[PDB]
Amino acid sequence: TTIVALKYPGGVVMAGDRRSTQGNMISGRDVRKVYITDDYTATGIAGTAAVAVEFARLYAVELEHYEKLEGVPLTFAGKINRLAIMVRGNLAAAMQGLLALPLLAGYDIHASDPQSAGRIVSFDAAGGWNIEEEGYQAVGSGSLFAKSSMKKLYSQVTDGDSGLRVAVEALYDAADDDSATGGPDLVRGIFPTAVIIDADGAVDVPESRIAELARAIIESRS
Amino acid sequence: TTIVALKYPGGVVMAGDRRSTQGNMISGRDVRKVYITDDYTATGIAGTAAVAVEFARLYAVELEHYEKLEGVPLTFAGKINRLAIMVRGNLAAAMQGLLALPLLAGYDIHASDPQSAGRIVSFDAAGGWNIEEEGYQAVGSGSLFAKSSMKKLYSQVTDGDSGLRVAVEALYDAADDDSATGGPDLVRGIFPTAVIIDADGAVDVPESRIAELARAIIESRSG
Amino acid sequence: TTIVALKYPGGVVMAGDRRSTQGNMISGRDVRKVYITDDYTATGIAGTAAVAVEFARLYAVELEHYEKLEGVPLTFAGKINRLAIMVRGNLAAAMQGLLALPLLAGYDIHASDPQSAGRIVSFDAAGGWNIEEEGYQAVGSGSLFAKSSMKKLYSQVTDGDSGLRVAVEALYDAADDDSATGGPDLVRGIFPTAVIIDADGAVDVPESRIAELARAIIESRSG
Amino acid sequence: TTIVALKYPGGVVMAGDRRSTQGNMISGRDVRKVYITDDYTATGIAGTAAVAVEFARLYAVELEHYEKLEGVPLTFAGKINRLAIMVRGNLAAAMQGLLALPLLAGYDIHASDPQSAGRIVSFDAAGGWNIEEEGYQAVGSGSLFAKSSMKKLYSQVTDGDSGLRVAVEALYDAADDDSATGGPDLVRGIFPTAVIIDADGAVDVPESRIAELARAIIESRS
Amino acid sequence: ISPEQAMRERSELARKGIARAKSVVALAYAGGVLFVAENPSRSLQKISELYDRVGFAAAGKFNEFDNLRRGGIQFADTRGYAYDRRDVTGRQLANVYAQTLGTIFTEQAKPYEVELCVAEVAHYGETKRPELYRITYDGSIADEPHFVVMGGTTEPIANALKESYAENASLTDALRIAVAALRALGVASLEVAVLDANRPRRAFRRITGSALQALL
Amino acid sequence: ISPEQAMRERSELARKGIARAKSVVALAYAGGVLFVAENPSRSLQKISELYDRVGFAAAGKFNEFDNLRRGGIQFADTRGYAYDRRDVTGRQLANVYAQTLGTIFTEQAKPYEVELCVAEVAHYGETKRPELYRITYDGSIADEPHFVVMGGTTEPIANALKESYAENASLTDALRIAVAALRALGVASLEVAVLDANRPRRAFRRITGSALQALL
Amino acid sequence: YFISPEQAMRERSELARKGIARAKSVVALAYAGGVLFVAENPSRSLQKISELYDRVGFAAAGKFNEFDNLRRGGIQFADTRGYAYDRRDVTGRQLANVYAQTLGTIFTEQAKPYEVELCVAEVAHYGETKRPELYRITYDGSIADEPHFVVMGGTTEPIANALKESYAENASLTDALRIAVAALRAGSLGVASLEVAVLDANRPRRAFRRITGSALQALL
Amino acid sequence: FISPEQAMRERSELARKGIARAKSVVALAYAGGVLFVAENPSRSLQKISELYDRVGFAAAGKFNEFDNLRRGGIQFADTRGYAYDRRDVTGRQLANVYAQTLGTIFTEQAKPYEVELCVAEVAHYGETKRPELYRITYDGSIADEPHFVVMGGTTEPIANALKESYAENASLTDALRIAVAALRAGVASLEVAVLDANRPRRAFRRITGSALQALL
Ligand SMILES: *C(=O)[C@]1([C@@H](O)[C@@H]2C=CCCC2)NC(=O)[C@H](CC)[C@]1(C)O
Ligand SMILES: *C(=O)[C@]1([C@@H](O)[C@@H]2C=CCCC2)NC(=O)[C@H](CC)[C@]1(C)O
């Protein structure tokens, strides 16, 4: 599994691969690992499928629950804390092999400077969180490959579209070196999913745009 | 054990073998592993017999319970979640060797496009679920042989009848390679059971229909 | 231990051996392992004696309890479910070695066809149950020997008496191959016990009938 | 990790490195490990990041909670006791690998002699505390190196600025010998953080001041 | 007040509430049992399925009998699961309602302003006369052989039926007889359902809209 | 304690406080459902989102109906999570408030001085008539087809609505009709919101400030 | 004796209305720099004005043991909320809402209702712009959004009107203090007899600030 | 529904009576700290006690009741000082706790406590601060007294007698005399103790026998 997130001027993009495995076997080819959790945030999760799906679903419910009860959404810091507490609550199960780690991406409507209101937050098994300030982050078995790729490509990110291209290429590099991360599948037409978030909110990136970028990366390396 | 499920234009079919074993011993030859759980869904279960049967029974009760209390049946997504929660509840027991894994097949009356309203959902021991998008799925010790067989035969599935025939042939291939999955028994006249679900609901496929398909498959491979 | 049960036209018969052991030592020669649990059912139990006996006693009380409270006996399916739940409740203890497995035989007064209203149900340690369709079943350390014997003799079963003879001979074959199962004891005059159940209810088979069958089996093989 | 604290005439200074790791991998370069917990105290934490952060956050809340309820802040001894109890409460978890150890620095407004009102307190996993009387202390994997360094440099501490210099140099020595402690990063412009506390309260030391001190130490050693 | 007064106080409180409510009738007919209630609402129901061959109908305060309806479904599903489906009966449900209302009437601050009817038809391909039970706000239970009337002013409706009640009446004849005795009224203002003894397992079946129209 | 006297006193105690409070109206219109309440406060609200297509409006003592509002959101979120979002309905929420108010009315020292309205509009791209339910202090529930009025003196506002009401009125026409029947007040004294059936998921939408200004 | 619920209601309300009238008065008013709290308070140890959270203040009139109880409960609620979510998620509206619900329950469920009247105020976050908010919660759980000032305890009428007339939006601290002390004085003094504090918008995090002794003197 | 206004009256009277009908106690600030003088003939049963380092306690009323509070206070204080620090315990905290406890007793227990308490605190060694005196009523009311406190029996006479003889910073002997006097308005019949601000840690100190006789 590989999920990446990176900041670009004015927003953030998060993208994830589509593979699920059971040992060496490829058990799924179209899993969606990145979720829009509220109007300004997306969550991508790696590790145990059952736990990750429940995290995303319960977390979205918790954010909207607060909003309906209090009349206003939680501050971005509050959203981070809720996700951290949820991860911490899974610690016992996680030590038993039910371990899932989320990656959070968001746009802070209350930030002073809009061009940099993008946020990326990572989490560890005990609920520790870290607001990433180097521009990008990744989780999953292919994360080191993705991060080393983004380290070299990040200077090319100047807007949402180039941010999306770098994210897709980082997932491409993860799949190239990690057998547990799925590459673009041209035969079946299945590609990584992505979510872009800017001042207008979080939106799913249409598959056709990703397919286009993936084909260009492949052409380029051929 | 092998339970298979596949989508065809307009519906879904689920079929299961009839064998039960205890170690190397064949202990049963007519076990039914596929249950109609409500008007539009069927559940097939592999693993521990005791947990398998209790899952199906309680699941059927739970679905109808909601329907009588609320006046309307659960949405298909709600049905999936209830089965997932029940599986998750058995996780501690599963780790102790009481593991059971269900395969859910259904027809979603509320889906926009009826030809593709068929649904196949698989579950892992932790309650994780996945709505299958590749057309078929299988669970049990013969599931890999069944799936590799359906991968080559699935293009022939153009409707509910060829879907049923393929399902039977996938079970046949599972039994051919997995000693824990039972093949058609011509001497005793016992064959895999199956359930078909379409817009008119879930129905048990008559044994005579399965027997014909099985005999035909056998004749073919004989030459 | 060996307990057998088989269906015959119009009913069912259940028989059990009389031996109890402690390791290699024969500790009992007249234990009764088959009980009439209600007017139409009998329970035979193998495994840990303390649990086996409690199961039979508590189960009979539970069946009659329902009957007195509700005015009508449980349906056969309900009787099966109650036994299964009782076995399931002993699972932890069973894992710790207090393992007991019952075999249930009955006649279903509500079945459509009377000639086949006989029922045989087996149970596993987790409470899983299976209504037997092959005509006979057996539990205990001599069960495989008994079943392989009934497999060859079952075609001779046409009524209650040929049914009883096959049951006694199956127990004789179990004792012949399993030192933990007791054979007919001609010196002390102790023989397997048996219950027959048909439309008129469950009745203990008189010892003198079993003695006569056992002696015939012995004489027959003596030459 | 390395966190150091030392007393100077009229106050106390506490400084921490910015590295976070996962095994041999450098997983963070800008972590902040020293927090102002109330107007006169700072806490620096080492160990499991999730626990360390929760300690710092929960502890600041507890101090202010008392103040609002009772109208007056806790005495310094009371502050020490509350931190100790919090650490003791984490002992079971600590035994399972979730160990966190805080270092407390403060200025006691009620001390008789102002020039020595500075306080440094260390804590062990069971909640045992010790008010240090030797002038400095450190916690974390680089603490022995830092302490041996301060042992030789401490006589140069005559005020806040030389105190801050010696603290930064002790952290430099800790990073020089302990791969788990981060040295000054001239390429990215990241330096240790520090808090100074005197009669006027606790204030964060500006990054530019620490950078000058670090560049001065580096030139000096080259 | 005195425990003697209490009971009449309560009893009155309940009788008033039920009297002040719409009416419902249940009657045995050739195909099983028919339920017809005066009900304007489209969402709030007074007739419901309880179990395979068991139906429920009530009159009175909605929040109170809906509560009892849920409790009944809970009891039935639990019983069926713990024993077998065929072990759940209309008599058991009536019995349970009797005991519950009896307890409410005696122990709860306010008695329930409701009147219930539990009905059961034979199992598929079986032969048995439908059963109808009425349970009142105080736990009293009665075995009715032909029909039951509850809610509002029953006298008029009761007699109206005591007169037109034809045994083995077809569905249409039964519907008419019922809608009539009730007036003593169309799809918009009525709720209709049957315990159809000819259904393989679930006998409860609602008759609405055009389908109901035709029958009217 | 005499059952009669108590049920009478409690009742008046609630009817009184409710009529004593500001008024609220909810009415079906072309785009879904419109909520308009007389509300001076800028912070304390009487209209709220409950779930995706379900809205809430109340009149009476604030602390009491806000309590109910929270309880409702709690119920809905828990239901949707335990089953699926699409399984939560306006009818279920109304049913729950009825059970809750009936329980309060009967078991609590003081009954709740509130009157609630639960509304639901169709799911995106679906077609279904809006649903409006009114739940009383006693726990009574009613299915209203066009509009609901609660709080203060309803008679005047009710009738005013009766003459004016138009099925399918546009938003502006509906707003006007409503603000009018209510007077029977500007953006600084009104709380306005709609369950917009055209919204993909969350239908609840507040109409305030300049935007509200325009419409009225 | 035994009474109807309606009578018991009026009785409780009176029982508490009496207790609040019988007590000293307090006023809170919005001013240029945030919110000002001024209460008639002889004691040096027992306080009627308190900080609740970063930008939220509390003031009460009535029976001390009862509103101090509520003050503590409020601080408990706020600290717990800020820790479970984020500091910036705690608001004056939330605190008022919680007090409304708590007093409502006390008024209804306890043998005696609380003889208290509370005011929760909130000012903008540092460098932010927002009109102060003032809420009044009464012994029965009723809550009201006041835009300019709040008066509680003793005979309010006189003090209320006195402010309706003197009160000026954007008054400086000194002008606001005077306006307040006079109005207050209308009821029935110096630093010894007054409790004064402000929620200061200018402060970066903790707004609550007590004004006492010489410093308070000077403002007079 | 029982009458609340009646109760407060009954209870309050019952308590006022018992306290009125009891021996008197006075506590007053003096040069060296605080002085406690109470009308007590009993050798063993005390009305004045140490609570914590610089905090003292004095009561009037039913012994078993205020002794219970004395023990509870010592408990609260010791627990607080251990959980935080000794210096963190204060007279204000203790008074506050007593106020809350009596308030709860007065409201929740069959009978209210017939007691009146005084908590006093003096400065820490070598520190300068005016002694503090608090009085807590049976109802749980609390008051900050600046010079002296009088409780038990008929206070009016003793109060005034004090209001005249009280001298800011009177020496111990002058304070004792002034007190014993205002009280009359014998060593065997008088209990005496002081919160001596000059003591390094424990301020509470009893003045009895010959020592007590000499100051007179
Ligand atoms: C990834 O973390 C991975 C995915 O199968 C899983 C599936 C769906 C969403 C959550 C992530 N989890 C695993 O256990 C695999 C093996 C290392 C996986 C492919 O990496
Ligand atoms: C199959 O999964 C299998 C079946 O015996 C069992 C029986 C009835 C319905 C549930 C599934 N389960 C087992 O444990 C066997 C082990 C080899 C089996 C044959 O695979």
Ligand SMILES: *C(=O)[C@]1([C@@H](O)[C@@H]2C=CCCC2)NC(=O)[C@H](CC)[C@]1(C)O
């Ligand atoms: C049989 O299962 C056996 C019997 O001793 C026991 C006794 C009375 C009725 C229940 C069955 N159980 C054992 O543990 C023995 C050893 C293998 C036994 C003889 O088989």
Ligand SMILES: *C(=O)[C@]1([C@@H](O)[C@@H]2C=CCCC2)NC(=O)[C@H](CC)[C@]1(C)O
């Ligand atoms: C330091 O103690 C260290 C830091 O990663 C950690 C992160 C943030 C603040 C608390 C301290 N903890 C560890 O486990 C690392 C490995 C030895 C670390 C770098 O020393």
